[PDB]
């Protein structure tokens, strides 16, 4: 049974774009139907890493449930997670992707954080996250309070260290900033470890799934 994505793109649906709860959360599909010009996708501008690969790996799915990998209300006691952006506005008001959280400073501080998740679900788990690139050094300090920040995602198959590239860009939707989006597959049994002292757009929901 095919999966209609409406006016949304694979990026938008899987990220949890606010203009993308739209649609009939489905549990299985054979192929993915997507308009050539979808209007609400990566609402906050930025590059989605390895996008064609993700569309293929998701082209065929037999089971699919969303679940809250890092619960919004218990995972982040030392960080503000409320931040929203006018670029992701639902019904007029500013908002954000439902599956990610924009972690920002709290009490004037952004402490080193590290949270992990072990796959116990007997299914492949799809994990998405972003890294934020502010357009100038004033924004970097305002959001994370440090000029030299790092993000490091490390699992058994994935090992990357992101440093934010801070500079002026051309404007997409009046934003000069970028969030770069990233994704890895989590084997039943594997564990993924996030470490950062800024710029992490942390995962909130992930997906368990299979392909036949």
């Amino acid at each position, epitope marked *: 049974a095919p999966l209609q994505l409406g006016n949304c793109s694979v990026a938008g649906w899987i990220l949890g774009n606010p203009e993308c709860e739209l649609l009939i959360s489905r549990e299985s599909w054979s192929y993915i139907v997507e308009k050539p010009n979808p209007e609400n996708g990566t609402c906050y501008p930025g590059h989605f890493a390895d996008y064609e690969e993700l569309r293929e790996q998701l082209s065929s799915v037999s089971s699919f449930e969303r679940f809250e990998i890092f619960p919004k209300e218990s995972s982040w006691p030392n960080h503000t997670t409320t931040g929203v952006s006018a670029s992701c506005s639902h019904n007029g008001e500013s908002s954000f992707y439902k599956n990610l959280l924009w972690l920002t400073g709290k009490n004037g501080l952004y402490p080193n954080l590290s949270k992990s998740y072990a796959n116990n679900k007997e299914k492949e788990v799809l994990v998405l996250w972003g890294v934020h690139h502010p357009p100038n050094i004033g924004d970097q300090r305002a959001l994370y309070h440090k000029e030299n920040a790092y993000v490091s995602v490390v699992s058994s198959h994935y090992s990357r260290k992101f440093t934010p590239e801070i*500079a*002026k860009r*051309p404007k*997409v939707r009046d934003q000069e900033g970028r969030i770069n989006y990233y994704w890895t597959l989590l084997e039943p049994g594997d564990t993924i470890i996030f470490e950062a002292n800024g710029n992490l757009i942390a995962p909130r929901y992930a997906f368990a799934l299979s392909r036949g």
Partner: antibody
Amino acid sequence: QVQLEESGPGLVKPSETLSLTCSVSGVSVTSDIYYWTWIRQPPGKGLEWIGYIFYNGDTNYNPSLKSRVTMSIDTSKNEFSLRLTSVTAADTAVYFCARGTEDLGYCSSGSCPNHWGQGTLVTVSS
Amino acid sequence: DIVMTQSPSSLSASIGDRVTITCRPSQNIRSFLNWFQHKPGKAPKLLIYAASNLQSGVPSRFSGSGSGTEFTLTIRSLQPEDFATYYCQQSYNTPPTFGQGTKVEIKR
């Protein structure tokens, strides 16, 4: 907020090498998120992209010109340069330097120069 | 290698008029299309990037539209300072290539 000042001969004799410099002010030529570009416009024709160079070393030159152009970065002077060999009257043009900001989601690599200098005219003549 | 055709090559319009310039790539380029403005003796300025995003400092009477194989820059009410030559530029495959330009003059 960034300035790009172009400099160079104005007159080049045919077959000789044209050299131009763009002195960059307001950012560092070593910041790896930007790339540096040259563009030209022959009299009465359209704009023709020459190439981009990133400080980390990745470069790409227009295939129409790739066998005659090289670009370089001089960190000591916060400059970058264009060298064009074996020129003819077809190379008479206003040459623009430009900065771009890498943004692969909205632009291919090195292809959206968004701060241009105002250009310097080079006339090829003997 | 992607060839850009802009139309028309020249136009005149009165103050307050709605002006429209079209751009046609030689193959489909999605949203990877930018618009530049070049006023006399000045540095070229990026007005619209990725088909429809108004760049900072650009007045909101400028808007870009289209995708795929037809693109449009519209000026909803011409002003004297909008005298310039406008160019489209595809950012879809390298090398970046430009249209021949549309020179806009005013009628007063």
